[PDB]
Design a protein around this ligand. Structure first.
Ligand SMILES: CN(C)S(=O)(=O)Nc1ccccc1Br
Lengths: 237, 300
């Protein structure tokens, strides 16, 4: 069934699973035309496919060329997502294929189920959680590779950097969703928090800064404060 | 005209013949139904006064034999049987007719309802859905499940309807996932019409038979089958014009005949709104849309 607060620890057991988030697949800017009408211009997108246990992120870059001459792009985007996830699964050795795929939006269920008919034993599941993966494009190195791409491309990342050397995947996922929730609520504040101290850098092979344990605790507190404030700033409290 | 005589009526029962029905009291001198139109299939069905559970009945065609009903007090139901001694059967039908102990199939001459509900229904196809090859007639009841239902437990007593499944490899060509799921024309026309049913008449016949099992026996899997066959046409962008026109007529008479009080259980809101308002065929079922809007506007 659906993934929710009650079956949360399932994400960190030893059954391979992937989250698929399609929010950033079809992205546009809206502008005015010379005649004063409105038009869209597509920009590069990505599928965010994540193993929450290991941190392995399969970032499939969606080049604007895939929309050329297509109609009903928002609907196509869901099917293209499904096609690419299915291709990913087929590319993996059998013992690395997921047992479950959890989609962050219910509209992906039918597209993915149909594309995965060859894998009847892979469960396709929705979730009741309001996960902040749309904020993945607020991570500078992920946005950078997406925007620079000139052709379809798969880029592999570990979204937890080296954290799993020191914390569990439950804790690593909690940190990730806090960071992303913060970046979604107030990107500028969130980014200020992460980079304010110039002496704490981001290694070339990492996405986030090289905080010590104590520094992560301070960071995490600042992100929680940010989120609660914006909640007030927004509902007036 | 054909006759289905009855050995006796030992238990109180509501007897249906096609869309007609009458109450028979316990041990009432009732000995069957005469003047049955030749050339159509028919269904004779039963609901005991003591048990509105289990509506049950028999699909038959008078051209395929002489049939009669006798109550079985061990199995506790009215059973259809065959008498191959034609002389003896004609003789038994004549005396009952002389003593006037038979009800007359009460067809109004202007009335084409039964023809319109059974236009494409064939006894030979019914016998492949309801497999009991030693009889020429076919027993159905409220509780029988369908093959597709059993897959998701006794197969001999199952309804072997053609399995339709929109999220199956049969429905979806590799490489045309989105195309074939949003426009089911290839599944309708190539897989089902050309491949399995051979022609649209056999398709419509199964569709009509599922509806009638749903209406007369409240058979849930039959309702599922009727809606699935409707939905497959309504979700196809490319359907022969003659099929659309005939479907509109088929569905019109089905909606017309449905009891006004059973619309809540026998009509799937989702499928009907798709056919009438969202689907490719939203503009192509004029008669069906008019009767649905005027008779069951709540459902929509
Ligand atoms: C004469 N009988 C009343 S019976 O024998 O019980 N009924 C019967 C037998 C064969 C054919 C039709 C009938 Br009705």
């Amino acid at each position: 069934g659906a993934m929710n607060s009650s079956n949360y620890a399932e994400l960190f057991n030893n059954d391979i699973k992937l989250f698929v988030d399609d929010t950033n697949v079809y992205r546009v800017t809206v502008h005015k035309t010379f005649e004063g009408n409105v038009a869209t211009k597509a920009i590069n997108g990505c599928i965010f496919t994540l193993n929450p246990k290991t941190g392995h992120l399969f970032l499939k870059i969606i080049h604007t060329s895939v929309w050329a001459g297509q109609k009903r792009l928002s609907q196509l985007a869901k099917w293209k997502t499904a096609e690419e996830v299915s291709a990913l699964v087929r590319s993996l050795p059998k013992e690395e294929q997921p047992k479950q795929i959890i989609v962050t939006r219910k509209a992906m269920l039918d597209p993915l189920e149909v594309h995965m008919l060859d894998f009847p034993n892979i469960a396709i599941r929705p979730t009741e959680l309001r996960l902040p993966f749309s904020a993945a494009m607020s991570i500078d190195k992920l946005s950078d590779v997406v925007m620079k791409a000139t052709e379809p491309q798969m880029v592999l990342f570990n979204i937890y950097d080296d954290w799993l050397d020191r914390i569990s995947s439950y804790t690593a996922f909690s940190r990730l969703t806090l960071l992303l929730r913060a970046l979604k609520t107030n990107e500028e504040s969130a980014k200020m928090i992460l980079l304010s101290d110039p002496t704490i850098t981001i290694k070339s092979y990492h996405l986030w800064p090289s905080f010590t344990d104590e520094q992560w605790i301070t960071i995490e507190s600042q992100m929680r404060d940010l989120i609660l404030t914006e909640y007030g700033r927004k509902y007036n409290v | 005209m054909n006759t289905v005589p009855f050995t006796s009526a030992p238990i109180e029962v509501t007897i249906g013949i096609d869309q007609y029905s009458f109450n028979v009291k316990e041990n009432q001198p009732f000995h069957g139904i005469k003047d049955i139109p030749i050339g159509h299939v028919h269904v004779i069905h039963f609901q005991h006064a003591d048990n509105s559970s289990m509506r049950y009945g028999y699909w038959f065609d008078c051209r395929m034999g002489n049939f009669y009903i006798q109550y079985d007090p061990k199995d506790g139901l009215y059973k259809m049987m065959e008498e191959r001694d034609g002389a003896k059967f004609e003789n038994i039908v004549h005396n009952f007719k002389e003593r006037q102990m038979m009800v007359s199939y009460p067809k109004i001459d202007e009335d084409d309802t039964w023809y319109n509900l059974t236009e494409f229904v064939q006894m030979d196809k019914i016998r492949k859905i309801v497999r009991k090859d030693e009889n020429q007639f076919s027993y159905v009841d409220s509780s029988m499940t369908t093959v597709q239902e059993n897959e998701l437990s006794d197969p001999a007593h199952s309804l072997n309807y053609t399995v339709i499944n929109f999220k199956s490899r049969e429905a979806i060509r590799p490489g045309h996932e989105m195309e074939d799921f949003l426009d089911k024309s290839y599944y309708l026309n190539t897989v089902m019409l050309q491949g399995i049913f051979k022609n649209s008449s056999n398709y419509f016949g199964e569709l009509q038979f599922a509806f009638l099992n749903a209406m007369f026996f409240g058979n849930y899997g039959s309702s599922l089958q009727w809606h699935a066959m409707i939905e497959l046409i309504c979700s196809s962008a490319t359907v022969p014009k003659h099929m659309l026109d005939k479907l509109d007529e088929i569905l019109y008479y089905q909606i017309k005949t449905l009891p006004e009080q059973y619309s809540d259980i026998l009509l799937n809101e989702r499928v009907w709104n798709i056919c009438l308002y969202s689907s490719f065929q939203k503009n192509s079922l004029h008669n069906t849309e008019k009767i649905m809007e005027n008779k069951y506007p709540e459902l929509l």
